[PDB]
Ligand binder design. Structure first.
Ligand SMILES: CC(C)n1c(CC[C@@H](O)C[C@@H](O)CC(=O)O)c(-c2ccc(F)cc2)c2c1C(=O)N(c1ccccc1)CCC2
Ligand SMILES: CC(C)n1c(CC[C@@H](O)C[C@@H](O)CC(=O)O)c(-c2ccc(F)cc2)c2c1C(=O)N(c1ccccc1)CCC2
Ligand SMILES: CC(C)n1c(CC[C@@H](O)C[C@@H](O)CC(=O)O)c(-c2ccc(F)cc2)c2c1C(=O)N(c1ccccc1)CCC2
Ligand SMILES: CC(C)n1c(CC[C@@H](O)C[C@@H](O)CC(=O)O)c(-c2ccc(F)cc2)c2c1C(=O)N(c1ccccc1)CCC2
Lengths: 423, 425, 422, 418
């Protein structure tokens, strides 16, 4: 049944045959003979799943363990939305367990929050925090700001010249010309106040803008390119060294995100009755405040933390992000959180808690939210896709849910640390 | 069959010969709704794990504004045996993350096919392009510089003079020997390194550090810390243990202490990319790459007020490999710490020297998510699955080196695209 | 050694007073409880004698009563110090002042006074000035200007603090607060507010120019009036502290590095390859190598925010003490990133630049009211208020600081590059 | 005024206008005028006259004093190109009750109310039973950067320094340079082919910069014998870190790490500090902890430690540029006592860079202020105890200053005039 290389090549070149007639072992025979490269297996094979099966068989003979791919699943998966959009060189998928904590009573609504994780007790802990919040009358949240950023670096011949460009961008007329260029690229491109910083002849420009319900990194990048092109017309000696000069700052810890915000800035709060702190959280209000000051404030201060004044916001942010099709790498900046706790009520025995997260980078359209399983989790929360009547409302709601769930996670872990229940 | 009356369903349930297996899904749901079977007691009462997940989904679906929300969230034919009571609770299914492959990665005279779980377009292809440049330049070399997971509890004494006494006692050879004895008694892999202590008035933050074989070590180090603090309490009975973690570890938050002291595996990688390879693979020059690395990764991060963020996108690669290999993806916060350096090299000064230094890669090949079969498949691709019997910690060390090397590949490709303005996807 | 009753008759005359008593009789009057330690400020006629008596009373409480022998105090103008600059004054502390120059900056020449006790600092800074002068001089620009104060207020809930933040961000709310702030002083002109929430806390960073003054007292007066006006719209608001460390004053803070505070400045020069070898005893290639791996990578490894330089703090502190500045503000004022590149047709010339986002400085008020300090300000042509262009003297002093820092950087970095650490 | 012909012939016979005409005529170069003039005060006078004709206002120098000051200890040690001295007012805050003793603390400042405020905080501590302090660590550092051909080579050097035999060789070389040189455990950090090595040692009563730099140079020379491919790029690679803000100083310490504490009775908080214990804690949490956190501070968890550090440093002949890191401080406040109305305060300062010998502490006025505190010069019987005592005084005075300012901020007592 296996044919030689030359007979198999004329069949593939045929416009009304292709690889359909050729067998599995026959296409792999063309790869080793080097007549067709490795990267020419996408647009030549008809179905996506068969292309995944061929990539896996070529891969298995390179690995030190032959049956390593055995328990990595690939069949019955919709690769149509993944190929040429979300992933390349695809050899299957990685199933991550999804649990549910809730109901989370947030802004007079009830949410069943999906959480994708492999850390034991995390879902159960977050659920216990939701239970305390619910018996305490619920939580309230506000989105304080909204605006994804990109922070290019440009170079002038001299620092005197870069100072000229900074001054020009600070005039109402200069900013207006740059804003028109930025806003011409997309419907949600709406440039907010510029933030500029000089380092000699370098100039770092932080462009900021809302992006509807998208996280908006591609949107902001397009607007930034157009704006810098317009800036070059007025200043032809300027060199665009990089569209990202790490001033954004994206996927790295940076004080600029902590202080200025990036994406959605959010605050959440709740009051937990003394009775609920006892019976649900197994501790006291006095014990909670004590651990919060000396762990989340003083402890993080001693550790030299910028933006890490919390117990484990990163656990909840990451779990929600993976379940809801977000960029999980943006957990770096999105986990920025300060958790504060005071005594409250008439007898000063109730627990006031608040979480403030100035840089939640989030979206309900684009990226991993285009995949159906991810959209199922977004649909649980009622935030799937773009909100037609109120652009950005679904992304803002998801950010509020993240902050609220983070607060629930902070309550439960801090109670366990305070009481010494570490089993 | 049709739903039988509630009295009949409760007789079959409490039979022992039949149980919940002889009831329908509809029959179990009507008992929970009428308050007979509590609701939370469905876990151990249902026979199989998959059917328990199915019932939880049906119950949950009636509480949603859109009851068909979970239709495309998969759940059937997945091995929940390893997940329940270990990795996840209140399980309603699983989330498929596409897995791409970036390789071969030539590192320490070996070749690696690196699994990467992501939904970010062009990331796997860009990483693969970086691997190509490294492979045509004679390969990369890496070293593990340090190894030791940490836990940083906060204890309190009545006064700062008392906490000072405890700090000094821990710094004596005799005091440290007693604490190391207690700590190391909790596990055969436990070997307590020198303690780092910091006072804040009457507070005392103690950073315990130790190897943990091939495990990431969080549980192991915490158990050691609990026993060590109990022993310290015998010598200082007035000491209060305020919290087993006082954020001095520091785990899953940005912190300068992880950058300066290290946490988990500290690793460095490097490679020389010939001038020809920089042109034909990366589509740029060595001069352009060095200019961007200085003014983006060093000066740019400096202007942004970054601690540990002196890189382009280490977090992208770290997160991808972590999700694929059953790691704690939340630990991307500190594990992504990286400084990328670039210099001219060779006789003509036209070749591109690059290094990536990552002082706090928190990683393991046993425990947690690495107990699941799918993420064991990805670990098996790299030859690092499970515990190494002949050399405890070698598998985890090897994985840390692959992360640093893959980050360096990703750094080369993205930095080349930024330098030359190849930003279209 | 007349008795107490006789000495009190002299003190109560009006035509006699403490001038007709000896030091021993005044101290005899104090130690015996007849004239408590407080009235002596009024009763002793000259400030210098009040200082002498304070020293003699203090000397009896010391383990070594002869401790103050070499601390000088006579023939100093205490009239501008008492009730304004220092309390419980027992004398003055001479700090050596040297001169580094000429510093060729913006087509002018400056002789820069530097108060220090660190050997080789003035000579090194002087060597840096020579390198810049032979290279055609340095150029600088003030990029921003505005002192800040960062109070913390509190509301009953985070929802309420969020409402206050949104109100301040409307043009209508900001206008009302700006009008209240600007009413307090002729130079009070409020710039955009920066705000940050932490639960029910709201941190508000007020920023304004302040003419030639460093502007701490002026910004605080405007801030108090502004928060009073803000309370009229939000009566549940509690002003917890006029400074909630969000300014941030005299502490290390990323907010100063990123947003600036006081004067933000940049300076630059190009040093010919010839000048680098002959004056600085090194090469351009050696200098760039050291700058990258010390000031950038080294500072990064140390976990530094704003400390991307060699010793900006040496020069800042030296000039500040000499020119009557607040030396404690060296914490934030020394923030600096030093960059070095190859330059010219063969890449053998050395481009240097220093960027300092938070130079907190003034030429009126504080220690700049004292005559010796005004002497150093007068050397640089920046003493006092500039009538014709308010703020020009303080802005010029900021430019001189940044230029002198760049000179100091050049010289020390050259020494480190060549191994000339003698 | 005679012509320039006869002036060639030593320098004491020629007048002031004669020597100045030699400078503007280029008879003798400027660098050959230092050793020729014998008397120091006259050498300063001539430099001032030369300088005057370069200034747009020659009269600017008139109120900058210079006469009657002993330049013998300044020249060739503390300052170059000397044109006079800058008088800074010194005031006294005390008695500061610290560790069963009482100190009269000198403070050189031009900030109105600083001494008076610190004095109030001292009064509160005194009536509250006094303060207690401890030196937790002691060791000045120098943090050179060296480079090897590759990162695998730098890794090899890091591993070698971590072995007991390798460290013992480097410690022997370091300790041979001085009697006070005792090298502690090395902290190292790689960045590719770079290797940053933090040398740390006690330095007797000296701040230690020159002693540590000499021991560091001998250590790196010895390291070069085992690794001849190693380039010493810079003796300071900013890893020390000296005179810049650095998290490594905050976490590992530098110089003296110190803690101080006190309990202020509720009555004393009301009557001396004019506030309440509850108001103080509320402000400390929300300003010094949360506020500093929102500002992105590393080590700046305090109100104005820098005011007190700077004032003491200038009065006592310290390097005032080292205020940058020496001011690092976290101020904590808690409810205390059985009433819970007493105020527990603590200040922790991990990186006080300080000394009682060398530098400005050689000058006699500076030594007078050190003599007030009983810490002037080297402690003969126990090296380092004078410098340790000064550090304890600084931490204690900072705490006094924290108490008074924080009370003023809490109560809203912000009027300077009264
Ligand atoms: C599951 C997860 C959230 N979790 C953890 C691990 C948190 C970790 O991922 C982040 C943490 O290190 C950041 C930090 O604080 O520095 C711990 C725990 C265990 C030992 C230890 F020494 C410290 C914590 C606990 C938990 C939980 O929440 N537990 C629970 C209690 C009560 C009810 C439900 C779950 C189990 C015991 C307490
Ligand atoms: C896929 C991923 C790595 N990636 C990205 C997004 C990186 C982002 O996740 C992290 C970044 O924000 C951190 C930072 O630098 O601050 C970009 C890109 C696009 C526009 C822009 F303005 C900036 C970058 C590119 C890429 C990639 O690598 N591309 C490629 C090139 C060459 C070959 C293959 C792929 C496509 C174009 C370049
Ligand atoms: C006087 C001052 C500026 N200065 C210093 C001390 C600077 C210090 O205050 C700040 C420093 O620690 C910050 C850092 O780099 O981390 C040094 C020096 C010595 C040994 C060492 F290991 C490091 C530096 C030198 C100097 C100077 O400039 N020197 C000179 C050369 C050539 C001409 C004139 C003076 C003498 C030798 C080099
Ligand atoms: C003299 C100095 C210490 N001091 C100052 C200026 C401190 C400044 O140098 C550092 C500060 O900005 C750091 C920060 O908090 O962020 C203030 C003051 C005034 C207004 C304001 F809005 C804030 C403070 C006060 C003082 C003092 O202590 N005062 C006093 C009280 C009580 C008794 C005696 C004097 C006068 C009123 C309070």
């Amino acid at each position: 049944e296996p044919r030689p290389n030359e007979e198999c090549l004329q069949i593939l070149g045929n416009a009304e045959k292709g690889a359909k007639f050729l067998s599995d072992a026959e296409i792999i025979q063309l790869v080793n003979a080097k007549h067709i490269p490795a990267y020419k297996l996408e647009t030549l094979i008809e179905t996506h799943e068969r292309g995944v099966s061929i990539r896996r068989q070529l891969l298995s003979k390179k690995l030190s363990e032959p049956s390593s791919l055995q328990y990595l699943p690939y069949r019955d998966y919709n690769y149509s939305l993944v190929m040429g959009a979300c992933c390349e060189n695809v050899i299957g998928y990685m199933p991550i367990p999804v649990g549910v904590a809730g109901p989370l009573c947030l802004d007079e609504k009830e949410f069943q929050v999906p959480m994708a994780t492999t850390e034991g007790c995390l879902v159960a802990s977050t659920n216990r925090g939701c239970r305390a919040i619910g018996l305490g009358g619920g939580a309230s949240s506000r989105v304080l700001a909204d605006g994804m950023t990109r922070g290019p670096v440009v170079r002038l011949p001299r620092a005197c010249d870069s100072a000229e460009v900074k001054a020009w961008l600070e005039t109402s007329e200069g900013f207006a010309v740059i804003k028109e260029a930025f806003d011409s690229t997309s419907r949600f491109a709406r440039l907010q106040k510029l933030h500029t910083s000089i380092a000699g002849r370098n100039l770092y420009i932080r462009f900021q803008s809302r992006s509807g319900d998208a996280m908006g990194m591609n949107m902001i990048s397009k607007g930034t390119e157009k704006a810098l092109s317009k800036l070059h017309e007025y200043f032809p000696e300027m060199q665009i060294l990089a569209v990202s000069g790490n001033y954004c700052t994206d996927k790295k810890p940076a004080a600029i995100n902590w202080i200025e915000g990036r994406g959605k800035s959010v605050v959440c709060e709740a009051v937990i009755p003394a009775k609920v702190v006892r019976e649900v959280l197994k501790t006291t209000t006095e014990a909670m405040i004590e651990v919060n000051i000396n762990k989340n404030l003083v402890g993080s201060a001693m550790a030299g933390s910028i933006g890490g004044y919390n117990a484990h916001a990163a656990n909840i942010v990451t779990a929600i992000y993976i379940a809801c099709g977000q960029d999980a790498a943006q957990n770096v900046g999105s986990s920025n959180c300060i958790t504060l706790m005071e005594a409250s009520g008439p007898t000063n025995e109730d627990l006031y808690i608040s979480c403030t997260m100035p840089s939640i980078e989030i979206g309900t359209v684009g990226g991993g939210t285009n995949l159906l399983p991810q959209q199922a989790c977004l649909q649980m929360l009622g935030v799937q896709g773009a909100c037609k009547d109120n652009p950005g409302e679904n992304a803002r709601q998801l950010a509020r849910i993240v902050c609220g769930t983070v607060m629930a996670g902070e309550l439960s872990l801090m109670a366990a640390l305070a009481a010494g229940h570490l089993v």
